[PDB]
């Protein structure tokens, strides 16, 4: 019953319930009114004086110190380069390696902030390039009858995706069952 519109970024069918018509029944509603939230937050701020800025301070000071390796501790993360789940530590690596190809070396600086700058910047890239491995046959000498052996060697190949295709992947969520 909220505001339905088309996203001019992705072309997706966006629905917005906020500041919507109040419910007429006890069925679940997402139609939360901003003013009522802001008032509730104000009341909280009054009864807990100067906590918001106190927390915002500590949070901000924490960010400055926070390194990138902080992202290498969270089970299975969605990897946009291969469009399947990978271990958190590898998901980061794959993103860092791919970011370098598009001239994004914020991760090298060590802190989380410059890496984060690269993430929101990467959305502005017209095409995003990333490595994806392909196998190659190669003759190798051996104590064989014919005197050789074929073995498959992997080699990184540069794949491209468009501005939108990358954005959607960035905004993507992989689904499972609990």
């Amino acid at each position: 019953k909220g505001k339905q519109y088309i996203s001019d970024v992705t072309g997706c069918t966006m629905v917005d319930p906020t500041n919507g018509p109040l419910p007429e029944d006890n069925e679940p509603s997402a139609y939360a009114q901003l003013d009522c939230v802001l008032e509730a937050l104000d009341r909280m701020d009054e009864e807990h004086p100067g906590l918001f800025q106190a927390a915002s301070q500590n949070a901000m000071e924490t960010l400055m110190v926070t390194t990138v390796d902080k992202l290498t501790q969270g089970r299975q993360t969605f990897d946009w380069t291969v469009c399947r789940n990978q271990p958190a530590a590898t998901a980061l690596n794959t993103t860092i390696t791919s970011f370098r190809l598009n001239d994004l070396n914020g991760a090298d600086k060590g802190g989380l902030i410059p890496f984060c700058q690269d993430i929101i910047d990467s959305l502005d890239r017209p095409e995003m390039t990333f490595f994806s491995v392909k196998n190659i046959k190669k003759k190798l000498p051996a104590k064989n009858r014919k005197g050789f052996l074929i073995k498959r060697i992997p080699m990184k190949v540069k794949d491209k995706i468009t501005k939108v295709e990358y954005i959607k992947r960035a905004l993507s969520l992989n689904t499972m069952t609990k």
Binding site: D69, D108, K109, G110
Partner: protein
């Protein structure tokens, strides 16, 4: 403990081994024949 540095991994490894060798020579752990190879191999980096 987590090693810190925005410089190259190779750079770090080179210097440490260079130092180790220099000190190993002057101390008397490493020989001249070995120290020849040490600095020679490190030169190739």
């Amino acid at each position: 403990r987590k090693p810190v540095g925005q410089h190259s991994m190779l750079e770090a490894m080179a210097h440490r081994l260079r130092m180790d060798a220099r000190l190993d020579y002057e101390s008397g752990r490493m020989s001249k024949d070995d120290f020849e190879k040490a600095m020679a191999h490190l030169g190739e980096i």
